Design a protein around this nucleic acid. Structure first.
Ligand SMILES: [Zn+2]
Lengths: 62, 344, 140
RNA sequence: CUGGGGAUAACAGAGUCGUCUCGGGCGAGAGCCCAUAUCGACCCCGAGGCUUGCUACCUCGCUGUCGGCUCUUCCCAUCCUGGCCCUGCAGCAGGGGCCAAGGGUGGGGGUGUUCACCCAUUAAAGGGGAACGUGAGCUGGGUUUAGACCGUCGUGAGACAGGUCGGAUGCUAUCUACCGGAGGUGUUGGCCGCCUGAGGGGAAGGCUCCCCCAGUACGAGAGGAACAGGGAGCCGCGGCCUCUGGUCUACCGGUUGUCCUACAGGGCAUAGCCGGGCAGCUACGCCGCAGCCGAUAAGGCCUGAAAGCAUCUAAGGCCGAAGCGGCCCCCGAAAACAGGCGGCCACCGAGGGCCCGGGAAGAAGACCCGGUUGAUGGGGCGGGGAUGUAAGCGGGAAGGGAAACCGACCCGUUCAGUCUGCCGCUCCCAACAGCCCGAGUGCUACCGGG
RNA sequence: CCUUGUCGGUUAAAUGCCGACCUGCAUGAAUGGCGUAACGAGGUCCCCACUGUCCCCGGCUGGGGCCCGGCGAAACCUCUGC
RNA sequence: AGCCGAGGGAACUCGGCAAAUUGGCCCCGUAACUUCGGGAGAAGGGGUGCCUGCGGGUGUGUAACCCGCAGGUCGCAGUGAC
RNA sequence: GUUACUCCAAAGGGUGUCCCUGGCCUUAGACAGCGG
């Protein structure tokens, strides 16, 4: 029972939950929720959302 | 001709509201061990675990996802003993003895209780029954029991039930009962982890429903959907017999039915809302509380799978009457993860 | 064992969801002349009144070739479904999905026609059909 | 067009069975030879009324419709599934027969089609009956009413058991019937609760593949089994919301046009449109569904006469099916022998109902929980969640400007603000006050003790 | 008429559509014959896109249906009604 | 009487009935066939918001109407509804 | 079977049982066993 990490929001999600999206070239993505999946594919940028970790990292980048 | 099977089953007819909301048990299993053959509690919620598969099949030895329902089981109070003899057609009640010291709140259910009935009269009646049992006139002995829902702040009105006892010797059963009367019973003293159980409850209510939902009939062609007969059936029958058959599907009550569900595994018995792993104790109540319920505080069963009924409802449990040959072993399985995250 | 030396068929524990009914088009992922097929049947399937046969990853289907080199056009072939868009569950509870719906053309006995598969395939298919996992680079 | 007609056709029914379908007797013979493993001529005897005809008993304003969709039930004259027998039965298979109707018998292409033909799967993709089941259930493609075209026939008006295009589908359920929900009476006083379980219903289960047995028996080879034992799925049935998806006119945010003077905050335009979305409902998600015990069918045997031997049968016994009965599940004291038990009252009054705060129940009724000996609804304080960082203030901003300054937008304050048909704690407000129904009598025949 | 004529193309599969063949039951030249750009709520076959038409049905919104107060008819009707 | 619907995309049906898709303006580009008039908006492809500044036409005009360019910036989406 | 009629299935088979007859055998016949 190990905890996977989300490719959009960077938080950990519990065993028996979420999704693995597989590209044909082999790159694997993990999603905690439909929210994150849908935002990632319609193109919202997580570096501007204060409920993600990429925001903290980009603030460090300011 | 095109052949196909009929729409729904005829084995649960008439499809009516249950007589009572407390479920009765019609048949009992054969168990050599002299014990009380079941228990009762209140449904609380669902979650899931991850565990190493113990059942026969492939996936044995593998980690697997398993869903779980939690039943809160405070201790029952054994308030009486009842004797049964053989009648002309079947069993007939001979005599009951009630205990003398009862909780106040039992009068909310049994409005007319005895008044004086001292300890001494109690012992005299038990002696009468012991002599009756020693004579040879008696075919069966059963316990009379009631719930205590004031220890969990759910209610004050109790549920009153009658349970059976395992084994063959009527005298041995009676000795068990004489030990148990006037004392509390806890689920650990009756059930074994890893056992298969049957579960009995009244199903969720849905009211009046039509035949698409009640019997699984087809929706009609889109022309009929625009003609006003989309969710109807076509016809009530042939010219002769010149009457509607009872077998033809129609609308009515759906849900609030009596149902029994076979072979659900008990996976763990807990204590004061906590479960013991290898080293640590963990609260099974999830963050924020079980929805449409609150916080589990007394004692609980984990039963894998799904069970009938709404959340705050009375559930009865017995040992399996119709189990398979290839059983899982009667020990608690090795659990690796229990979900405590919010369920809302 | 009668003949265990070289076997074509295997055993998976998962059983994905039947997601692709009769009439579905499938992109061909191997290096045979075919490019697009259409499902006309699902091998080993019995239904009921007005229900269509449907297949998921790991299942053998009967198909017709729609686009492809002229020797293969209008032929009825067997194929194994190797990639699908609809989610299905693993033993741990996690759902997996892919980006397209894709099949690989085989013989009734199970032997692949072709030498390589282009892209990722599913572990369920590689397990049910053992000779595909050798001609596929990436397996999940 | 009028008046009439079942005195008289079309159609469903009724009758009959030449014809039809399904059988049988004998045996011409065919089968290396051998009547009957298989096939059986010519003559002769029948069953059925689902094929067409014959007749004219019923019906001329009952309904006149074919086909398809939907839904229920019945038969066996058995395609598959269970069990057996013979063979021109080595094995794998075939052919022909007996028991058996519990379950299954599907998806598509052209045509209005039933039927028939074809394709890919399949254990097999059986057929019939119920007003050629089913239009007060749907459809209306076909069935030449009124319009129109072609061919042919006819002086012509016109016609065609010829083709082609188009062409109105009404109904507030009186009685019974069924599905479900309630109120009474009775059960020889009334009330509370727990049980028994007569009788009724059930397919609650049915089927396929894979591994192993085993490259074995069998067999010249090539090919190629079975009992037991292990796994997975398809169809059917019953439930549940942890996980995954859909909806979520609760909620949060973005943005267009216009009105409230701009700001802030709002109204209207399908919730204006777009994105997300908990609870709840739901499947495209998940959980569960025994094989044993008895008696039988075809069939296989024992003992054993009639008929000193022999013989499965005449009297008697043992075995033996997915079929019958039981176990198991659902309804069930109006089960007219209208039940059993414990307790309360009675011979003012036990007990019930309305009213009140509610919901896990619900078309009205009914069900369930609570009512100050109280956390039932609300408020307040906290928790868990949904969305996505408010207003104000400050600091910047591509560029413009003599300059004070303008500026869509960016950063900070700020996981913020707004919300919560979920949980907890706390008597702060309200569960106050009441109003109705309610069993009392004996005669004779008694019963067991007074 | 035999008729789903025969051959070819279109489909996994064609009583359809298109093109050819000619024993035209019963075509044919102002009861006009053969063609034809543009036009058609005309009839008919195919391809791209799209979709709850269907696999297989689910959840929402308003109005009715249901309960309450008021106004208040009709068609139909031998008697009845397992 | 209306809104949404995962994966498939006419397998539905006599028949794609009904529903969906497309949609305004500017630039590019446009087949067969033809009565040379058309077909033709054939088909097919790119772009479109806000703010800051520069320029043109007519005009006496920092009056009024119309036509182009460059840069910055936000959003899943700029004929954002109609 | 328990049907006077209105309103009831054969050709062909069985000696299943109860009866009437006619020929050949029978002081050892039809087999049942030891043998030629
Ligand atoms: Zn995430």
């Amino acid at each position: 029972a190990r905890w996977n990490v989300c490719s959009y929001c960077g938080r950990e999600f519990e065993p028996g939950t979420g999704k693995m999206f597989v590209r044909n070239d082999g790159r694997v993505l993990f999603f905690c929720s439909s929210k994150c999946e849908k935002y990632y594919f319609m193109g919202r940028n997580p570096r501007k959302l204060k409920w993600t970790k990429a925001f903290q990292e980009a603030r460090l980048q300011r | 001709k095109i052949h196909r099977p009929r729409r729904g089953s005829l084995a649960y007819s008439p499809r009516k509201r249950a007589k009572s909301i407390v479920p009765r048990i019609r048949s009992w299993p054969k168990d050599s061990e002299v014990r009380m053959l079941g228990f009762a509690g209140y449904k609380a919620g669902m979650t899931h675990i991850l565990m190493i598969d113990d059942s026969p099949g492939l996936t044995k030895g593998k980690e697997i996802f398993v869903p779980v329902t939690i039943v809160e089981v405070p201790p029952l109070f054994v308030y009486g003993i009842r004797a049964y003899k053989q009648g002309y057609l079947g069993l007939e009640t001979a005599t009951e003895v009630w205990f003398h010291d009862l909780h106040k709140n039992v009068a909310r259910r049994i409005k007319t209780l005895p008044k004086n009935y001292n300890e001494e009269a109690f012992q005299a009646k038990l002696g009468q029954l012991e002599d009756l049992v020693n004579d040879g006139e008696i075919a069966d002995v059963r316990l009379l029991v009631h719930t205590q829902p004031w220890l969990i702040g759910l209610k004050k009105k109790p549920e009153v039930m009658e349970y059976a006892i395992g084994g063959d010797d009527v005298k041995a059963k009676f000795d068990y009962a004489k030990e148990k009367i006037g004392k509390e019973l806890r689920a650990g003293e009756v059930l074994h982890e890893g056992e298969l159980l049957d579960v009995i409850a009244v199903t969720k209510g849905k009211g009046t429903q039509g035949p698409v939902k009640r019997w699984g009939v087809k929706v009609q062609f889109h022309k009929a959907q625009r003609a006003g007969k989309g969710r109807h059936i076509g016809n009530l029958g042939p010219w002769h017999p010149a009457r509607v058959m009872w077998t033809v599907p129609q609308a009515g009550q759906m849900g609030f039915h009596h149902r029994t569900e076979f072979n659900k595994r008990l996976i763990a018995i807990g204590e004061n809302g906590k479960l013991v792993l290898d080293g640590n104790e963990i609260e099974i109540t999830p963050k924020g509380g079980f929805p449409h319920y609150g916080i589990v505080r007394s004692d609980f069963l984990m039963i894998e799978g799904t069970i009938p009924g709404s959340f705050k409802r009375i559930i009865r449990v017995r040992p399996a009457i119709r189990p398979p040959k290839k059983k899982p072993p009667v020990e608690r399985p090795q659990i690796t993860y229990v979900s405590r995250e919010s369920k809302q | 064992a009668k003949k265990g030396a070289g076997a074509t068929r295997g055993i998976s524990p998962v059983r994905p969801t039947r997601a692709l009914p009769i009439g579905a088009y499938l992109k061909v992922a191997d290096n045979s002349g075919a490019k697009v097929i259409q499902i006309i049947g699902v091998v080993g399937y019995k239904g009921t009144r007005r229900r269509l046969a449907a297949a998921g990853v790991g299942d053998m289907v009967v198909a017709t070739v729609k686009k492809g080199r002229p020797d293969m056009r209008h032929q009825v072939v067997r194929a194994v479904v190797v990639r699908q868009r609809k989610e299905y569950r693993r033993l741990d509870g996690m759902r997996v999905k892919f980006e397209d719906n894709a099949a690989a053309i085989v013989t009734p006995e199970g032997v692949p026609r072709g030498t390589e598969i282009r892209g990722a395939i599913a572990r369920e298919a590689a397990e049910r059909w053992v000779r595909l996992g050798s001609i596929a680079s990436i397996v999940l």
